[PDB]
């Protein structure tokens with residue numbers, strides 16, 4: 001029944017279409033994690049998206065390890081976000097701030113402090129720093145004091161997002177970051193009430209969501225989960241035993257919308273024979289369901305036609321096609337994205353991909 005071009009309501013957010021811009025870390029903020037004027041241009045270019053989900057935005061210095069990524073804990077960050085968000089609204093667009101705690105996926109050279117997690121684990125591979133890739137450090141397992149402080153940071157970030165004029169927030173509970181580190185048995189070795197059985201592994205996500213809901217309203221709160229596929233050293237061996245109850249809980253708490261990132265056995269941003277949980281989650285989460293990863297125009301039109309999703313989020317296509325909706329509507333070819341400028345500092349590979357009007 002619905003097509004990508006039909007409007008949709010994300011709680012009180014009236015989106016003109018069901019073509020969502022997925023959250024994309026670009027590293028065009030400054031070294032104090034304050035957004036920059038070039039980010040106002042980037043988001044305004046993409047305002048024809050029914051909904052923009054921002055790049056992951058740090059809730060705290062502790063939880064932000066990504067060089068040149070923005071935060072939203074500080075008044076200076078809020079002030080820099082305001083015109084970015086205003087430019088999107090002036091174009092009739094909608095935008096939500098993706099709230100990030102990176103958990104063990106940080107380097108102390110960036111945060112000034114030991115990475116923190118569910119448990120004292122080391123992420124595989126290398127971590128981005130201002131001085132190049134470094135070996136990951138072993139994290140420390142957060143205690144009750146840390147959990148109270150981090151819940152405070154999620155609360156403050158949520159309030160600051162509304163203060164900056166955002167239409168809502170999405171809790172980043174995916175891709176092997178803090179919340180996902182609690183959800184997966186691989187990264188959660190805790191002996192306390194946040195460890196062991198599924199309901200315990202879900203409790204951190206529950207407390208974060210409840211605190212954000214209390215601060216800004218359930219109707220302005222979304223979540224992202226990546227149920228299937230080891231993303232960044234983070235696998236559950238029985239994902240349905242934690243991800244379906246998590247989605248059930250998010251339904252029960254009144255969460256306005258859920259996005260699932262689902263790699264395929266032959267994904268371009270993740271590969272896994274761990275099946276997709278989307279169909280099971282669709283039955284237990286009943287408000288708008290956004291699916292993401294390797295969608296094409298036709299795959300997205302078909303997901304919607306078959307009631308598998310209410311909307312589709314596109315990441316890489318929105319890097320290089322600021323007017324993606326218009327291109328889909330008119331059957332215009334999509335431009336390729338330049339991987340080399342995903343995370344560089346300049347306007348090159350950021351604001352210089354033309355619309356199918358503005359250049360060649």
Ligand SMILES: Cc1cc2nc3c(=O)[nH]c(=O)nc-3n(C[C@H](O)[C@H](O)[C@H](O)COP(=O)(O)O)c2cc1C
Pocket residue numbers: 022023024025026054055056098172174175224261269292293294295313314315316317342343
């Ligand atoms: C450069 C880049 C940055 C990304 N940054 C984020 C992020 O900040 N938060 C997030 O949840 N996912 C992030 N992702 C994952 C994307 O949102 C999306 O799930 C992924 O690109 C798969 O969708 P696609 O096939 O439509 O690109 C990023 C992906 C890329 C390629």
Ligand SMILES: [Cl-]
Pocket residue numbers: 108109110111112
């Ligand atoms: Cl520092």
Ligand SMILES: [Cl-]
Pocket residue numbers: 174175176180226227228229230231234
């Ligand atoms: Cl994951």
Ligand code: NA
Pocket residue numbers: 025
């Ligand atoms: Na990233």
